[PDB]
Enzyme design. Structure first.
Site, PDB file in Angstrom:
ATOM      1  N   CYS A 112       8.660  90.966  18.325  1.00  0.00           N
ATOM      2  CA  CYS A 112       8.983  91.169  19.728  1.00  0.00           C
ATOM      3  C   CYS A 112       9.155  92.640  20.076  1.00  0.00           C
ATOM      4  O   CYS A 112       9.609  93.475  19.279  1.00  0.00           O
ATOM      5  CB  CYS A 112      10.226  90.404  20.112  1.00  0.00           C
ATOM      6  SG  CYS A 112       9.823  88.678  20.066  1.00  0.00           S
ATOM      7  N   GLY A 139      10.091  89.137  14.208  1.00  0.00           N
ATOM      8  CA  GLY A 139      10.264  90.570  14.195  1.00  0.00           C
ATOM      9  C   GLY A 139       9.242  91.338  15.010  1.00  0.00           C
ATOM     10  O   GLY A 139       9.331  92.561  15.089  1.00  0.00           O
ATOM     11  N   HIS A 189      16.430  90.083  24.949  1.00  0.00           N
ATOM     12  CA  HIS A 189      17.071  89.148  24.035  1.00  0.00           C
ATOM     13  C   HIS A 189      17.504  89.811  22.719  1.00  0.00           C
ATOM     14  O   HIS A 189      18.075  89.135  21.859  1.00  0.00           O
ATOM     15  CB  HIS A 189      16.192  87.919  23.757  1.00  0.00           C
ATOM     16  CG  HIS A 189      14.897  88.212  23.063  1.00  0.00           C
ATOM     17  ND1 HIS A 189      13.686  88.200  23.719  1.00  0.00           N
ATOM     18  CD2 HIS A 189      14.615  88.463  21.762  1.00  0.00           C
ATOM     19  CE1 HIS A 189      12.714  88.449  22.859  1.00  0.00           C
ATOM     20  NE2 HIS A 189      13.252  88.634  21.666  1.00  0.00           N
TER      21      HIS A 189
HETATM   22  C1  YVG Z   1      10.318  88.067  18.478  1.00  0.00           C
HETATM   23  C2  YVG Z   1      11.842  88.144  18.293  1.00  0.00           C
HETATM   24  C3  YVG Z   1      12.222  89.214  17.289  1.00  0.00           C
HETATM   25  O1  YVG Z   1      11.542  90.183  17.128  1.00  0.00           O
HETATM   26  O2  YVG Z   1      13.361  89.013  16.503  1.00  0.00           O
HETATM   27  C4  YVG Z   1      14.459  89.829  16.708  1.00  0.00           C
HETATM   28  C5  YVG Z   1      15.288  89.786  15.408  1.00  0.00           C
HETATM   29  C6  YVG Z   1       9.870  86.617  18.156  1.00  0.00           C
HETATM   30  C7  YVG Z   1       8.375  86.353  18.071  1.00  0.00           C
HETATM   31  C8  YVG Z   1       8.017  84.795  17.767  1.00  0.00           C
HETATM   32  C9  YVG Z   1       8.616  84.542  16.402  1.00  0.00           C
HETATM   33  C10 YVG Z   1       7.481  84.151  15.463  1.00  0.00           C
HETATM   34  N1  YVG Z   1       6.245  84.579  16.145  1.00  0.00           N
HETATM   35  C11 YVG Z   1       6.575  84.910  17.568  1.00  0.00           C
HETATM   36  O3  YVG Z   1       5.803  85.278  18.408  1.00  0.00           O
HETATM   37  N2  YVG Z   1      10.396  85.824  19.276  1.00  0.00           N
HETATM   38  C12 YVG Z   1      11.319  84.744  19.032  1.00  0.00           C
HETATM   39  O4  YVG Z   1      11.642  84.460  17.928  1.00  0.00           O
HETATM   40  C13 YVG Z   1      11.839  83.990  20.245  1.00  0.00           C
HETATM   41  C14 YVG Z   1      13.209  84.537  20.633  1.00  0.00           C
HETATM   42  C15 YVG Z   1      13.379  84.052  22.065  1.00  0.00           C
HETATM   43  C16 YVG Z   1      12.765  84.819  23.230  1.00  0.00           C
HETATM   44  C17 YVG Z   1      12.921  84.281  24.652  1.00  0.00           C
HETATM   45  C18 YVG Z   1      13.678  82.983  24.892  1.00  0.00           C
HETATM   46  C19 YVG Z   1      14.273  82.215  23.719  1.00  0.00           C
HETATM   47  C20 YVG Z   1      14.104  82.743  22.298  1.00  0.00           C
HETATM   48  N3  YVG Z   1      11.954  82.575  19.918  1.00  0.00           N
HETATM   49  C21 YVG Z   1      10.746  81.796  19.834  1.00  0.00           C
HETATM   50  O5  YVG Z   1       9.677  82.334  20.053  1.00  0.00           O
HETATM   51  C22 YVG Z   1      10.805  80.309  19.474  1.00  0.00           C
HETATM   52  N4  YVG Z   1       9.433  79.824  19.366  1.00  0.00           N
HETATM   53  C23 YVG Z   1      11.614  79.494  20.484  1.00  0.00           C
HETATM   54  C24 YVG Z   1      10.988  79.356  21.856  1.00  0.00           C
HETATM   55  C25 YVG Z   1      11.421  80.294  22.972  1.00  0.00           C
HETATM   56  C26 YVG Z   1      10.808  80.165  24.358  1.00  0.00           C
HETATM   57  C27 YVG Z   1       9.763  79.090  24.645  1.00  0.00           C
HETATM   58  C28 YVG Z   1       9.346  78.141  23.527  1.00  0.00           C
HETATM   59  C29 YVG Z   1       9.957  78.282  22.134  1.00  0.00           C
END
Ligand code: YVG
Ligand code: YVG
Lengths: 304, 302
Positions: free
Chosen positions: B145, B143, B41
């Site tokens: 991920c 950030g 992603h």
């Molecule tokens: C990691 C993404 C990252 O590093 O940013 C790149 C600029 C991040 C980690 C979560 C954010 C806050 N704490 C976490 O663990 N992941 C996301 O933001 C994630 C992006 C994503 C990934 C797969 C599918 C859709 C979106 N979005 C989320 O975690 C949100 N909670 C939305 C969400 C996604 C899937 C299931 C339920 C909610």
């Protein structure tokens, strides 16, 4: 979100760990540039430990009686000196993995990471707090002496603890890296006891802010109290007195959540007097006191 | 003596962490030999989140759309492909710090260490368990991920987890290093819910043994039980059933303490039915289930 007992990354310290052997005794040392630091009781045997004559034990030793290995590879000792309760072994090889570092003395109530090591090999890393009675509730077995505690400030490793001994109560005692013990302990095997331990109030409040930041708010009401009235309750439950300086360092967490420090104090007072009523807070059924305000900020803001 | 939530030393993994940027999106990657692994992603923006067409997004990108930095040295991307939900970026320089490693897919109840990282820089390490519902209760901010979970097998790093997302319940989901999610989750921002979570019984028993080794002994009773009768109690309190392999895995702790596993099961039965009555075990007022039998042995034997 989430909140874990988080330690600093240990890589910079792992590369400094060595094993120091003197005769039949082996423990861990910390290899920084061309010096290895370890507990001086490595030069002792059983006949010595009630009243070790450390200066006598050391003068009978040559640089050749110290065997230092870095990853089971021998380093040549070319000098030896004693500073308080630490032995300083000068070696012929400078450690190319030495990080930027400082020797620091931490304050009671503060936390650090411990890299538990055996025979110079790291086993694990965990987070510890220096208790108000100057012990730590660590996890150490035979052979762990010389394991160190540390914080990372910026890109600098601040070493604050070297492990020496376990008290009968199961808690641990050691020195700073200058060889001075924390608390009223000596490296001779007299009967030694730590004072009564207390709960670190400012850390409990920090952890309650961590719970609020993570959405676990059930203990919050629109209550507030005074510092004097809170402290009257704190001492009834063996909590340290909360000073205005403690209030100040909680500022950042109060600023993030909008919950005034004395409102959180009122919430904590209600938890102490009425209990938690079978509820958990951040996965714990007890009030946790080994997260500092800075610990919570670091984990709730992701500093690197 | 003592017993702590203890992670593996993180040094071998720290040397593998890099920053991956696509457009204005930055997260962490894992640099092993001449490949950087990261969540796919990274190639998405706000529009794509509902149903990202990852194959379209990836094929349209060029190597130049990817900025990989190890510290502040740039690693030039020479290829880009997808394996399940992980992006594989082929870079020009192999990581000089590549450890002996394996990609492993772990099973529910197993624990691992997580090196939480931001912009390619390690922030901290902690211990996690793969929950029975294939989520983890981690500590991740925006950030984070691409942060990885791992175990160390002497000299070999066994990577088992790469972080992708947070469910609205506060728990976390991600993939193995082959890009396959643990559990039924997908990398789409769709209403996703974790199944009912249960307590990892074999881990609770391991922790009770850790308590006995450390002198906490008030919860021991003289009764023994059977695996069938104990499992009826486990089911009532949403504990995972205990298998004979679990019993045997507890064997090293039974050997150290002299307390038979089924005797410890009877003590746990009484704890579950009536709680702890104001008493603590290893500094906890709850039954802890994120230490495996191995975690207890490794920590109580060094
Ligand atoms: C990691 C993404 C990252 O590093 O940013 C790149 C600029 C991040 C980690 C979560 C954010 C806050 N704490 C976490 O663990 N992941 C996301 O933001 C994630 C992006 C994503 C990934 C797969 C599918 C859709 C979106 N979005 C989320 O975690 C949100 N909670 C939305 C969400 C996604 C899937 C299931 C339920 C909610
Ligand atoms: C570290 C010693 C070592 O590694 O070298 C030999 C292989 C070890 C750590 C404790 C052992 C079990 N878990 C521990 O944390 N330290 C000792 O064994 C220590 C030696 C010592 C240090 C200072 C003063 C006298 C002896 N001995 C103990 O810890 C014993 N519990 C005895 C004791 C000493 C001082 C106060 C109270 C009890």
């Amino acid at each position: 979100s989430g909140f874990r007992k988080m330690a600093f990354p240990s890589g910079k310290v792992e590369g400094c760990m060595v094993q120091v052997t003197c005769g039949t005794t082996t423990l861990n040392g910390l290899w920084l540039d061309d010096v290895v630091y370890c507990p001086r009781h490595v030069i002792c045997t059983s006949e010595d430990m009630l009243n070790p004559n450390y200066e006598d034990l050391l003068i009978r030793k040559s640089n050749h009686n110290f065997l230092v290995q870095a990853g089971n590879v021998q380093l040549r000792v070319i000098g030896h000196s004693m500073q308080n309760c630490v032995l300083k072994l000068k070696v012929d090889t400078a450690n190319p993995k030495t990080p930027k570092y400082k020797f620091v003395r931490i304050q009671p109530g503060q936390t650090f990471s411990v890299l538990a090591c055996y025979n110079g090999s790291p086993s694990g890393v965990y987070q510890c707090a220096m208790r108000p009675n100057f012990t730590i509730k660590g996890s150490f077995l035979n052979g762990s002496c010389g394991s160190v505690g540390f914080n990372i400030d910026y890109d600098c490793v601040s070493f604050c603890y070297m492990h020496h001994m376990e008290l009968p109560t199961g808690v641990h005692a050691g020195t700073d890296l200058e060889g001075n013990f924390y608390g009223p302990f000596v490296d001779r095997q007299t009967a030694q006891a730590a004072g009564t331990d207390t709960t670190i109030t400012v850390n409990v409040l920090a952890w309650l802010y961590a719970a609020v930041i993570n959405g676990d708010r059930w203990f919050l009401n629109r209550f507030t109290t005074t510092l004097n009235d809170f402290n009257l309750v704190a001492m009834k439950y063996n909590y340290e007195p909360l000073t205005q300086d403690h209030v100040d360092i909680l500022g950042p967490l109060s600023a993030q959540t909008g919950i005034a420090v004395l409102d959180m104090c009122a919430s904590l007072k209600e938890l102490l007097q009425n209990g938690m009523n079978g509820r958990t807070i951040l996965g714990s059924a007890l009030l946790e006191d080994e997260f500092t305000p800075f610990d919570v900020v670091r984990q709730c803001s992701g500093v690197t």
